[PDB]
Design a binder for these strands. Structure first.
Length: 70
RNA sequence: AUCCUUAUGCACGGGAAAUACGCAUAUCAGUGAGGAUUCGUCCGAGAUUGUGUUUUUGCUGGUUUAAUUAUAA
């Protein structure tokens, strides 16, 4: 169900295999926050950082090397 | 006091390899790299990028003739 999410297939094909392993973990931790949040008050701001890391690190995985001097 | 287990250092002795060993004011990475599956799950530390040398590193071995001096005159 994750491989069909937005944060994976919005990126080029070659990056998919690494994003699953990268996204799955960040999903689990999110759930591990949700178990600890009290029912009365549920709060974000961990998932904001955790989208930042994933999107940026994905741009970086897609960025390709710089050119090399002959 | 003896005996034993693990890890590390030094070392005698015995092998195997040098397409092998390293380096980085560099990018990520147990806050999950990289894989595996019998589809339930299972394993758990490197991967990228640049670069140095790599029929080779250091050191060695082999091969290409002294002086003195003696006759009977």
């Amino acid at each position: 169900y994750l491989f069909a999410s937005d944060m994976i297939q919005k990126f080029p094909v070659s990056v998919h295999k690494q994003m699953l392993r990268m996204l799955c973990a960040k999903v689990s931790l999110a759930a591990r926050v949700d178990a600890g949040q009290k029912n009365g008050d549920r709060n974000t701001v961990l998932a904001h950082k955790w989208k930042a890391e994933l999107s940026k690190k994905a741009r970086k995985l897609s960025e390709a090397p710089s050119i090399s001097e002959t």
